[PDB]
């Protein structure tokens, strides 16, 4: 009764698992560990300062932003960075995970690994 | 009954809106979107590694720190940075929003835009 | 009844105080202010991108990661950085505070000061 599990599918067919815990008027969502995204999962694979991961699945998830430590692997480099992440729903009802970064690079993302991320808050 | 709205005024006459949600012994405060501060809103407009925004308004707000992604516009540059922010009350009862940054610059702030910020926690 | 106080000891004999607040199924832990660690407190004092602080004390603390602003003093430099921190328990039941950073440096930590840190969440 405390929690529910859910998931999303990425464009490349990856599964993002999460668990939601209701704490009265708020919900805390924790993502599954060892999450890795391919460049193919992003709307654009360019390593921009705003990245969009379109999602599919059964239930919307709309959150405040949370801090993550991510690793971005490009052909030539490895970038280890604190980023902010947020689950948002599009005007077309399409769920997205948005990743906000400090510095745009003219490089293509091969992988993004989430090392660790703070729990996500939603105000229900 | 769950929440209350409040606001602060900045030195330049800007309005910071917020909504507070009580979750038993804690309060979660969410700031209004699209917040932009002028250099004139800071105690000092120099782009120091600690920035202070003095506030006026009806009710104190004292919080733990939260992470934000901010944009700092100076005459010559645009800096997009993760920062920590915290609402604190001064020894004189003056409320402040404090912004803590990584790197002091000898430049004057024209604008600070909050792109996104994690909710603020207070332990009541 | 709302809270409990606890502490850990560091290798150099420093005391980390904390206060835990239960909010139904979650616990919020706030660390004592003015925390300073010596290089001697780390498993390795090299300024790596993952730092481990072994702890002793009466009660495990297992948390999600939280953002901190830290100052790292080395012989030659002062680094002011946002980092993520997390309390984890080892396979041997040894509690650790882990600090995750962006950039490894081939320098020895003299001190790490926590300037400010977001509260820690545990899902009980
Ligand atoms: Cl797409
Ligand atoms: Cl994108
Ligand atoms: Cl966060
Ligand atoms: Cl590339
Ligand atoms: Cl002033
Ligand atoms: Cl200032
Ligand atoms: Cl935060
Ligand atoms: Cl300037
Ligand atoms: Cl050790
Ligand atoms: Cl270490
Ligand atoms: Cl955090
Ligand atoms: Cl050194």
Residue numbers in the entry:
A (entry chain A), B (entry chain A), C (entry chain A): 327 to 450
Sentences from the paper on this structure:
Adenovirus fibres are trimeric proteins, which consists of three different domains: an N-terminal penton base binding domain, a thin central shaft domain and a C-terminal globular fibre head domain. Adenovirus infections are usually initiated by the interaction of their fibre heads with primary receptors, followed by internalization mediated by penton bases interacting with integrins. Here we present the structure of the raptor adenovirus 1 fibre head, which does not appear bind sialyllactose, and show that deletion of the beta-hairpin insertion does not significantly affect the stability of siadenovirus fibre head domains. Like the other siadenovirus fibre head structure, that of TAdV-3, the monomer has an ABCJ-GHID beta-sheet topology with kinked C- and J-strands resembling reovirus fibre head structures.
The beta-hairpin arms of the RAdV-1 and TAdV-3 fibre heads (residues 359-NYGLR VVNGE LQNTP-373 and 349-DNIGV IENPT FYRNK S-364, respectively) were replaced by a short fragment containing two amino acids (EF and VD in the structure of RAdV-1 and TAdV-3 fibre heads, respectively). Data to 1.7 Å resolution was collected from one of the crystals and processed. This structure could be solved by difference Fourier synthesis and directly refined, as the crystal form was isomorphous to the non-mutated fibre head. Structure superposition of the native RAdV-1 fibre head and the beta-hairpin arm deletion mutant showed that the main architecture is highly conserved, apart from the mutation introduced. The beta-hairpin arm is replaced by a short loop and the conformations of the BC- and HI-loops are slightly affected. In the trimeric form, the interaction interface of the mutant RAdV-1 fibre head now only contains hydrophobic interactions involving fourteen amino acids from each monomer, accounting for 11 % of all residues. Only seven intermonomer hydrogen bonds are present, although the intermolecular salt bridge is conserved. The mutated RAdV-1 fibre head trimer has a solvent accessible surface area of 16.9 × 103 Å2, with 5.9 × 103 Å2 of buried surface, which means that now only 25 % (instead of 33 %) of the total surface gets buried upon trimer formation. The thermal stability of the mutated RAdV-1 fibre head protein was assessed by a thermofluor experiment and compared to the native versions. Deletion of the beta-hairpin appears to destabilize the structure somewhat, because now some unfolding is observed at high temperature (dotted line in Fig. 3a). The somewhat lower unfolding temperature can be explained by the loss of hydrophobic interaction surface and some of the intermolecular hydrogen bonds made by the beta-hairpin arm, and is consistent with the assembly stability prediction.
